[PDB]
Amino acid sequence: QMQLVQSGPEVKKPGTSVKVSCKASGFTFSSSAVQWVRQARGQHLEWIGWIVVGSGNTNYAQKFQERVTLTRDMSTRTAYMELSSLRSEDTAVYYCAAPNCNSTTCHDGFDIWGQGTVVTVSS
Amino acid sequence: QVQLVQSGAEVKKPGSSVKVSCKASGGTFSSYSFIWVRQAPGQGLEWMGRIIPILGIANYAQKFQGRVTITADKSTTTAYMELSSLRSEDTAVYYCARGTEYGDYDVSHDWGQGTLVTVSS
Amino acid sequence: QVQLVQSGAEVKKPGSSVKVSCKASGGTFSSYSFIWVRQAPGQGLEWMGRIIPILGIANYAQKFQGRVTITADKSTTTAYMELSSLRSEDTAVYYCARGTEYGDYDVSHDWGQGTLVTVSS
Amino acid sequence: DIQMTQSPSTLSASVGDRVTITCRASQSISSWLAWYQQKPGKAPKLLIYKASSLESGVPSRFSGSGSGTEFTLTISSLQPDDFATYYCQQYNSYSHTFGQGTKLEIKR
Amino acid sequence: DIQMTQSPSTLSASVGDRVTITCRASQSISSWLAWYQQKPGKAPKLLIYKASSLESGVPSRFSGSGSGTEFTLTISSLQPDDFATYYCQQYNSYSHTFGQGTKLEIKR
Amino acid sequence: LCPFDEVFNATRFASVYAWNRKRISNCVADYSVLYNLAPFFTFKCYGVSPTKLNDLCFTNVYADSFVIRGDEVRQIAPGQTGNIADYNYKLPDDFTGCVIAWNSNKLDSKVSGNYNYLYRLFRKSNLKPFERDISTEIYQAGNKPCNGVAGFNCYFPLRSYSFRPTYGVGHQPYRVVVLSFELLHAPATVCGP
Amino acid sequence: NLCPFDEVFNATRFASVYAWNRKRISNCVADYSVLYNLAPFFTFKCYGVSPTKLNDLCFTNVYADSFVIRGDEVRQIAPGQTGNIADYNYKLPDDFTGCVIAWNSNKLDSKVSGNYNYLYRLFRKSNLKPFERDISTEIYQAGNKPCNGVAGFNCYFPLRSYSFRPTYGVGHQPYRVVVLSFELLHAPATVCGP
Amino acid sequence: EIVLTQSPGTLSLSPGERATLSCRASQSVRSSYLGWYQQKPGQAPRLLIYGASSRATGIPDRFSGSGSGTDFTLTISRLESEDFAVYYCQQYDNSPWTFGQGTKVE
Neighbours of H60 (CB within 10 A): 13
G169:F50 CB<8 A:
no
First vs last C-alpha separation in chain H: 32
Domain at D4-106: CATH code: 2.60.40.10
In the stretch 4-43 of chain E, residues with CB closer than 8 A to chain F read 30-32
Distance between CA atoms of residues A70 and A80, nearest Å: 6
Q: Do chains B and G touch (3 or more CB pairs under 8 A)?
A: no
In one-letter notation, the amino acid at residue B106 is D
Residues of chain D positioned with their CB less than 8 A from the CB of G106: none
G171:F47 CB<8 A:
yes
Residue in A44, A62, A110 nearest the CB of H101: A44
For residue G26, tell me if it sits in a domain. yes
Neighbours of F185 (CB within 10 A): 5
Which chain G residue's Cα is nearest to D53?
A: G12
Closest among A115, A107, A31 to H57, alpha carbons compared: A107
User: In residues, how long is chain H?
Assistant: 106
In chain C the domains, ranked by start, together with CATH numbers, are 3-119 (2.60.40.10)
Which chain G residue's Cα is nearest to D49?
A: G12
Where would I find the beta strands (DSSP E) of F17-112? 22-24, 45-46, 57-58, 60-68, 97-103
Task: Summarize chain H as % helix, strand, coil (round to 5).
Answer: 5, 40, 55
Distance between CA atoms of residues A71 and A83, nearest Å: 12
Neighbours of E11 (CB within 10 A): 14
Closest among H62, G12, H51 to C104, alpha carbons compared: G12
Three-class SS state of B97 = strand
Write down which chains contact chain G via at least 3 CB pairs under 8 A: C, D, F
- Name G21's bridge partners: G66
**What's the gap in Å between the CA of A90 and the closest CA on chain F?**
28
G171:F77 CB<8 A:
no
In the stretch 94-123 of chain F, residues with CB closer than 8 A to chain A read 121-122
Distance between CA atoms of residues B61 and B37, nearest Å: 11
- Name F181's bridge partners: F61
Closest among A15, A33, A32, A23 to A83, alpha carbons compared: A15
Where would I find the beta strands (DSSP E) of chain D? 4-7, 10-13, 19-25, 34-38, 45-49, 53-54, 62-66, 71-75, 85-89, 102-106
Radius of gyration of chain A (CA): 14
H-type helices in chain F, by residue range? Answer: 5-8
Which chain D residue's Cα is nearest to G12?
A: D53
F112:E30 CB<8 A:
no
F115:B54 CB<8 A:
no
- Name B4's bridge partners: B24
Closest among E1, E2, E8 to E25, alpha carbons compared: E2
D1, D32, D49, D67: best mutation site toward chain G, by most G Cβ within 10 Å?
Answer: D32
Number of E to F CB contacts under 8 A, please give it.
Answer: 21
Residue F187 carries which DSSP code? Answer: P
E101:B44 CB<8 A:
yes
Neighbours of G13 (CB within 10 A): 17
Give the angle A93-A97-A98 at the CA atoms, nearest 5°: 170
Distance between CA atoms of residues F171 and F154, nearest Å: 27
**What's the gap in Å between the CA of F58 and the closest CA on chain B?**
33
In this structure, the dihedral spanned by the alpha carbons of residues F29, F30, F35 and F37, taken in order and rounded to 10 degrees, is -50
Closest among H36, H35, H31, H25 to H83, alpha carbons compared: H36
Radius of gyration of chain C (CA): 14
Neighbours of G24 (CB within 10 A): 8
Which long-range CB contacts under 8 A does B47-56 form with residues at least 24 apart? B47/E89, B47/E95, B47/E96, B47/E97, B47/E98, B48/B81, B50/B99, B50/B105, B50/B106, B50/E96, B52/B105, B52/F115, B54/B30, B54/F156, B55/F115, B55/F156, B55/F158, B55/F159, B55/F160, B56/A57
Residue E2: half-sphere exposure toward Cβ, Cα within 13 Å: 23
Do residues G104 and G173 touch, judged by C-beta distance below 8 A? yes
G111:D30 CB<8 A:
yes
What is the β-pairing status of strands D34-38 and B10-12? unpaired
In one-letter notation, the amino acid at residue F109 is S
User: What does the domain layout of chain D look like in residue ranges?
Assistant: 4-106
Do residues G60 and G184 touch, judged by C-beta distance below 8 A? yes
Residue A114 carries which DSSP code? Answer: -
Distance between CA atoms of residues H87 and B11, nearest Å: 52
Distance of alpha carbon E22 from the chain centroid: 8
Distance between CA atoms of residues B97 and E26, nearest Å: 26
Do residues B95 and B43 touch, judged by C-beta distance below 8 A? no
Query: What is the DSSP track for E37-59?
Result: EE-TTS--EEEEETTTEEPTTS-
Residues of chain F positioned with their CB less than 8 A from the CB of A107: 142
Do residues E98 and E5 touch, judged by C-beta distance below 8 A? no
B55, B62, B76: best mutation site toward chain F, by most F Cβ within 10 Å?
Answer: B55
Residue in C30, C59, C105 nearest the CB of G117: C105
Closest among D29, D24, D40 to D88, alpha carbons compared: D24
F71, F102, F169: best mutation site toward chain C, by most C Cβ within 10 Å?
Answer: F169
Distance between CA atoms of residues E28 and A106, nearest Å: 48
Closest among C74, C39, C71, C76 to C57, alpha carbons compared: C71
Domain that holds residue A69: 3-121
Q: Is the dihedral of CA E35, E39, E41, E42 positive or negative?
A: negative
DSSP H or E segment with residue A70: strand A68-73
Do residues E71 and E88 touch, judged by C-beta distance below 8 A? yes
Three-class SS state of B18 = strand
Which long-range CB contacts under 8 A does A78-83 form with residues at least 24 apart? A78/A21, A78/A22, A78/A23, A78/A24, A79/A21, A79/A22, A79/A24, A79/A34, A79/A51, A79/A53, A80/A19, A80/A20, A80/A21, A81/A19, A81/A20, A81/A21, A81/A36, A81/A48, A82/A17, A82/A18, A82/A19, A82/A20, A83/A17, A83/A18
Do residues A79 and A68 touch, judged by C-beta distance below 8 A? no
Q: How many domains does chain A have?
A: 1
H92:F152 CB<8 A:
yes
- Name E7's bridge partners: E22
Three-class SS state of A52 = strand
Residues of chain F positioned with their CB less than 8 A from the CB of H32: 144-146
Give the CA diameter of chain A: 49
The burial of B13, by beta-carbon neighbours within 10 Å (0-12 exposed, 13-18 middle, 19 or more buried), is given as exposed
Three-class SS state of F51 = helix
Distance between CA atoms of residues E23 and E6, nearest Å: 5
Asked if C59 has any chain G CB less than 8 Å from its own CB, the reply is yes
- Torsion angles phi and psi, residue G34, rounded to 5: -65, -35
Distance between CA atoms of residues G178 and G46, nearest Å: 12
In one-letter notation, the amino acid at residue E29 is I
CATH code of the domain covering residue G74: 3.30.70.1840
**What's the gap in Å between the CA of G110 and the closest CA on chain D?**
9
Q: Is the dihedral of CA B4, B8, B9, B12 positive or negative?
A: negative
Distance between CA atoms of residues E85 and G167, nearest Å: 59
Which long-range CB contacts under 8 A does G143-150 form with residues at least 24 apart? none
Do residues B121 and B86 touch, judged by C-beta distance below 8 A? no
Distance between CA atoms of residues H6 and E45, nearest Å: 57
Residues of chain D positioned with their CB less than 8 A from the CB of G112: 92-93
- Name F149's bridge partners: none
Q: Name the interface residues of F facing H (CB cutoff 8 Å).
A: 144-146, 149, 151-152
Do residues C44 and D87 touch, judged by C-beta distance below 8 A? yes
For residue F172, tell me if it sits in a domain. yes
Which chain B residue's Cα is nearest to F115?
A: B105
Closest among G71, G121, G89, G87 to G20, alpha carbons compared: G89
Write down which chains contact chain C via at least 3 CB pairs under 8 A: D, F, G
Q: Is the dihedral of CA F4, F6, F11, F14 positive or negative?
A: negative
Residue in G108, G112, G113 nearest the CB of D31: G108
DSSP H or E segment with residue C72: strand C68-73
Distance of alpha carbon H40 from the chain centroid: 14
The burial of E83, by beta-carbon neighbours within 10 Å (0-12 exposed, 13-18 middle, 19 or more buried), is given as middle
Domain that holds residue F30: 1-119+159-193
Where would I find the beta strands (DSSP E) of chain B? 3-6, 10-12, 18-25, 34-39, 45-52, 57-60, 68-73, 78-83, 92-98, 110-111, 115-119
Closest among F152, G150, B100 to E46, alpha carbons compared: B100
Number of B to F CB contacts under 8 A, please give it.
Answer: 15
Give the CA diameter of chain G: 61
Do residues F19 and F65 touch, judged by C-beta distance below 8 A? yes
The burial of C29, by beta-carbon neighbours within 10 Å (0-12 exposed, 13-18 middle, 19 or more buried), is given as middle
Residue F6 carries which DSSP code? Answer: H
Distance between CA atoms of residues F165 and F103, nearest Å: 12
Topology (CATH) of E5-106: Immunoglobulin-like (2.60.40)
Asked if C105 has any chain G CB less than 8 Å from its own CB, the reply is yes
Distance between CA atoms of residues F107 and F12, nearest Å: 8
Q: What is the 3-state secondary structure (H, E, C) of E60-93?
A: CCEEEEECCCEEEEEECCCCHHHCCEEEEECCCC
Burial D14-52 (b: 16+ CB within 10 A, else e): eeeeebebebbbeeebbbbbbbbbbeeeebbbbbbbbbe
F116, F137, F138, F158: best mutation site toward chain B, by most B Cβ within 10 Å?
Answer: F116
Do residues B67 and B85 touch, judged by C-beta distance below 8 A? yes
Residue in F144, F146, F149 nearest the CB of H51: F144
Integer CA distances (angstroms), C9 to C6, C92, F97, in order: 10, 11, 54
Radius of gyration of chain E (CA): 13
Residues of chain F positioned with their CB less than 8 A from the CB of H92: 151-152
Distance between CA atoms of residues H20 and F19, nearest Å: 58
F40:C56 CB<8 A:
yes
In one-letter notation, the amino acid at residue D30 is S
Closest among D49, D104, D57 to D80, alpha carbons compared: D104
Helices first, then strands: H and E counts in chain B = 0, 11
Give the angle G110-G116-G118 at the CA atoms, nearest 5°: 85
In chain H the domains, ranked by start, together with CATH numbers, are 4-105 (2.60.40.10)
Distance between CA atoms of residues G140 and C33, nearest Å: 22
Q: How many domains does chain F have?
A: 1
**What's the gap in Å between the CA of D64 and the closest CA on chain C?**
16
Distance between CA atoms of residues G46 and B100, nearest Å: 64
Residue in G12, G107, G111 nearest the CB of D52: G12
Closest among F101, F63, F69, F105 to F84, alpha carbons compared: F69
Closest among H37, H58, H61 to H49, alpha carbons compared: H37
Neighbours of D65 (CB within 10 A): 12
DSSP H or E segment with residue A72: strand A68-73
DSSP H or E segment with residue G8: helix G6-9
Radius of gyration of chain F (CA): 18
Residue in B44, B59, B111 nearest the CB of E98: B44
Closest among G107, G118, G103, G102 to G163, alpha carbons compared: G118
Which chain F residue's Cα is nearest to E1?
A: F112
- Name F72's bridge partners: none
Residue H20 carries which DSSP code? Answer: E
Distance between CA atoms of residues A82 and A96, nearest Å: 13
Which chain F residue's Cα is nearest to A51?
A: F152
In one-letter notation, the amino acid at residue H13 is L
Do residues G139 and G95 touch, judged by C-beta distance below 8 A? no
CATH code of the domain covering residue A28: 2.60.40.10
For residue G48, tell me if it sits in a domain. yes
Three-class SS state of E7 = strand
Closest among B97, A44, E31 to F110, alpha carbons compared: E31
In one-letter notation, the amino acid at residue H66 is S
In one-letter notation, the amino acid at residue G31 is D
Residues of chain F positioned with their CB less than 8 A from the CB of A33: 152
What is the β-pairing status of strands G175-181 and G98-104? antiparallel
Distance between CA atoms of residues D20 and D35, nearest Å: 13
In one-letter notation, the amino acid at residue C89 is E
Neighbours of H99 (CB within 10 A): 18
Integer CA distances (angstroms), D26 to D2, D68, D70, D90, H22, in order: 6, 10, 10, 11, 53
